[PDB]
Design a protein around this ligand. Structure first.
Ligand SMILES: [Cl-]
Ligand code: NA
Ligand code: NA
Length: 129
């Protein structure tokens, strides 16, 4: 599913990401934009052999099992394919564990390089939230 911007902002709020670990909703929408282009089916291989999955590009190196990332962890206790659903529940639940692990949103390379320190409130402008 390719979410609209305000559609994703509304789903992310419904699921408790607005101000989660102190990150406003616009940070999460900006991260999803530059990680996945709002596409739940996005997958991208990493140089170490892991893959990133879904709207927030969650890495099989630590967070999910994809059956082909040796010596990796599954800290969200899920198959990586769960993170590709039209239902973002599994991605949001797992993202809450990631952002809580001490690194905050710096875990998301696209967030650090493209959203951090910008006017992220712009990502929720015009949405009826
Ligand atoms: Cl933090
Ligand atoms: Na894994
Ligand atoms: Na999907």
């Amino acid at each position: 599913k390719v979410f609209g911007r305000c559609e994703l902002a509304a789903a992310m709020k419904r699921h408790g990401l607005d101000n989660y670990r102190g990150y406003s909703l616009g940070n999460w929408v900006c991260a999803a934009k530059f990680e996945s282009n709002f596409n739940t089916q996005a997958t991208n291989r990493n140089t170490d052999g892991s893959t990133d999955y879904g709207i927030l590009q969650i890495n099989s190196r630590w967070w999910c099992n994809d059956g082909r990332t040796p010596g990796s962890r599954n800290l969200c206790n899920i198959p990586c394919s769960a993170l590709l659903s039209s239902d973002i529940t599994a991605s949001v639940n797992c993202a809450k564990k990631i952002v809580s692990d001490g690194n905050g949103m710096n875990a998301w390379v696209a967030w650090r390089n493209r959203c951090k320190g910008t006017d992220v409130q712009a990502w929720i402008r015009g949405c009826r939230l």
